[PDB]
Design an enzyme around this catalytic site. Structure first.
Site, PDB file in Angstrom:
ATOM      1  N   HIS A  88      40.345  38.956  31.750  1.00 35.13           N
ATOM      2  CA  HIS A  88      41.627  39.671  31.516  1.00 35.13           C
ATOM      3  C   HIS A  88      42.734  38.682  31.116  1.00 35.13           C
ATOM      4  CE1 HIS A  88      42.537  39.667  36.086  1.00 35.13           C
ATOM      5  NE2 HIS A  88      43.322  38.771  35.506  1.00 35.13           N
ATOM      6  N   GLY A 117      49.642  35.722  38.779  1.00 35.29           N
ATOM      7  CA  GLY A 117      49.394  34.307  38.453  1.00 35.29           C
ATOM      8  C   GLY A 117      48.284  33.704  39.309  1.00 35.29           C
ATOM      9  N   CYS A 157      45.259  35.048  39.885  1.00 33.24           N
ATOM     10  CA  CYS A 157      43.918  35.414  39.404  1.00 33.24           C
ATOM     11  C   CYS A 157      43.250  34.137  38.871  1.00 33.24           C
ATOM     12  CB  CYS A 157      43.957  36.558  38.403  1.00 33.24           C
ATOM     13  SG  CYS A 157      44.137  38.218  39.098  1.00 33.24           S
TER      14      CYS A 157
HETATM   15  C1  LIG Z   1      45.803  38.204  39.805  1.00 31.59           C
HETATM   16  C2  LIG Z   1      46.802  38.038  38.675  1.00 31.59           C
HETATM   17  O1  LIG Z   1      47.229  36.919  38.401  1.00 31.59           O
HETATM   18  N1  LIG Z   1      47.163  39.126  37.960  1.00 31.59           N
HETATM   19  C3  LIG Z   1      48.023  39.041  36.784  1.00 31.59           C
HETATM   20  C4  LIG Z   1      47.286  39.588  35.585  1.00 31.59           C
HETATM   21  N2  LIG Z   1      46.911  40.990  35.796  1.00 31.59           N
HETATM   22  C5  LIG Z   1      46.218  41.531  34.613  1.00 31.59           C
HETATM   23  C6  LIG Z   1      46.771  41.038  33.311  1.00 31.59           C
HETATM   24  C7  LIG Z   1      46.155  40.183  32.404  1.00 31.59           C
HETATM   25  C8  LIG Z   1      46.868  40.052  31.190  1.00 31.59           C
HETATM   26  C9  LIG Z   1      48.131  40.621  31.289  1.00 31.59           C
HETATM   27 CL1  LIG Z   1      49.410  40.511  30.150  1.00 31.59          CL
HETATM   28  S1  LIG Z   1      48.344  41.491  32.753  1.00 31.59           S
HETATM   29  C10 LIG Z   1      46.063  41.085  36.990  1.00 31.59           C
HETATM   30  C11 LIG Z   1      46.748  40.509  38.211  1.00 31.59           C
END
Ligand SMILES: *CC(=O)N1CCN(Cc2ccc(Cl)s2)CC1
Ligand SMILES: *CC(=O)N1CCN(Cc2ccc(Cl)s2)CC1
EC number: 3.4.19.12
Lengths: 304, 304
Positions: B41, B143, B145
């Site tokens: 993601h 941030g 993840c």
């Molecule tokens: C766990 C974490 O950092 N997050 C932030 C990102 N979110 C999904 C996304 C990825 C790209 C984006 Cl723009 S938003 C999950 C939770």
């Protein structure tokens, strides 16, 4: 979201842990620059800990009696001195992994991470607080002494604790890195009882702020209180008196949540008087007091 | 003595954490040998997370779009691939700090340490369990993840978890290091509800053994039970059914304390039926289920 009892990353401190022996099996030392810091009771025998005369015992020890090992590599001891209840062993090699560091003496209610070690080898890391009775509630078996407690501010490790002492009640005592015990404790196997383990009120309030930020809100009520009224209830339940300094320190959490400190005090008052009624707050069934306001802000804001 | 929720020392994993960005701000990656592992993601925009087609989104990404930074040093991406829900970014430099490691997929009820990171920088370390509903109860903000979960066996890091997902109920979901989600969760912003958070019975019993070893014994009673009788009570209180495998796993703690597993089951049964009556066990007011029998033995024996 979510709120966890969180320790500092231990890497910078792992790099500092060594093994020390001085005739009577092993404990841990802290290697910073060209000095290894360890509890002076490393020099004790099984006859000594009842009434040790450390200056007299130390006279029988030479540099070559202090065996200092970093992993599988031996360090050469070129000097030794006693400072209060710690020994400082001068080695001929600066620890190449020495981080930026400070020695700080923390106040009761301040939290820190412990890196539990045995024979200079890290076993694990957990969060502690200096209790109002100047004990800590640790996890320390024989061989763990010389394990240290620390905070990190970005890249600077502040060492605040070195483990020395288990009281017969299974709570822990130790020193700052100048070798001065927290509280009235001594490195002697004697009658030493902890005083009242009072609850750190300001930390409980911080954690209630953490709960609200993370969705746990059932304990918010329609009430307020005053410092003097709250303090009558604190007294009855062996809580530290709340001061305007504590109110001022909670200001940022107040500002972020929009809940006045004295309103959160009124929530805490009802929880004290009424209990949890079988409910939990951030996965606890009791009021958690080992998060500082700084800890809550740090964890809630993702500081590194 | 003393028994603490303890994480593994994080140093070996701190050495592996990097920052990844791919057009839409940052998360963490894990750098082992010449591969950086991160949630797929990272490639999503604010339009994508509702119904992302990852293969289609990935077609628009080249090696030079994945910005990988280890401290202040940039890594050169020479290849990229998707494996399930993780990306593997091939870099031209082997991580010099790569520890001995394994990727393991843990079972529900197994515990692990998380190194919470933001922008490739460690913020802290805490202990988790894989819940029976295949969630974890973490501390993860935007941030975080790509933060990973791990066990250490002496010098070998077993990575078991990578953080991907926060459910609207504030519990956490993620993958093993092959990019397969634990449980039924998907990396899509959709209606995903956790099932029953059942209590890990075998871990509660382990922790009751820990309490006895550390002097907390008020809950021992004159009773015994059977697996089938205990399991009637487990069912009523949303506890995992106790199996002979669980009894066998508790054998060492049974042997050390001299308390038959089924007698400790009868203690747990009374605690379930009667509650704590305002008492605590190892500083908890509820029955702790995120220590495995292996965890209790490790901490009670001082393993490093
Ligand atoms: C766990 C974490 O950092 N997050 C932030 C990102 N979110 C999904 C996304 C990825 C790209 C984006 Cl723009 S938003 C999950 C939770
Ligand atoms: C904390 C720890 O390791 N210990 C073991 C040592 N003990 C005092 C002694 C020092 C020399 C001895 Cl021989 S016994 C304190 C607890």
């Amino acid at each position: 979201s979510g709120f966890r009892k969180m320790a500092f990353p231990s890497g910078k401190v792992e790099g500092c842990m060594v093994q020390v022996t001085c005739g009577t099996t092993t404990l841990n030392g802290l290697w910073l620059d060209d000095v290894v810091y360890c509890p002076r009771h490393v020099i004790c025998t099984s006859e000594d800990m009842l009434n040790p005369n450390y200056e007299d015992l130390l006279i029988r020890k030479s540099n070559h009696n202090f065996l200092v090992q970093a992993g599988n590599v031996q360090l050469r001891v070129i000097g030794h001195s006693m400072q209060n209840c710690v020994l400082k062993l001068k080695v001929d090699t600066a620890n190449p992994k020495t981080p930026k560091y400070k020695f700080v003496r923390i106040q009761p209610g301040q939290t820190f991470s412990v890196l539990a070690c045995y024979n200079g080898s890290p076993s694990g890391v957990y969060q502690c607080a200096m209790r109002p009775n100047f004990t800590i509630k640790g996890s320390f078996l024989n061989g763990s002494c010389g394990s240290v407690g620390f905070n990190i501010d970005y890249d600077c490790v502040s060492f605040c604790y070195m483990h020395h002492m288990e009281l017969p009640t299974g709570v822990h005592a130790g020193t700052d890195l100048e070798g001065n015990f927290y509280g009235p404790f001594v490195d002697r196997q004697t009658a030493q009882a902890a005083g009242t383990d009072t609850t750190i009120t300001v930390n409980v309030l911080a954690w209630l702020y953490a709960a609200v930020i993370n969705g746990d809100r059932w304990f918010l009520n329609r009430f307020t209180t005053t410092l003097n009224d709250f303090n009558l209830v604190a007294m009855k339940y062996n809580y530290e008196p709340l001061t305007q300094d504590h109110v001022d320190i909670l200001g940022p959490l107040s500002a972020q949540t929009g809940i006045a400190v004295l309103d959160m005090c009124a929530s805490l008052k009802e929880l004290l008087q009424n209990g949890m009624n079988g409910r939990t707050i951030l996965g606890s069934a009791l009021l958690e007091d080992e998060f500082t306001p700084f800890d809550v802000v740090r964890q809630c804001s993702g500081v590194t």
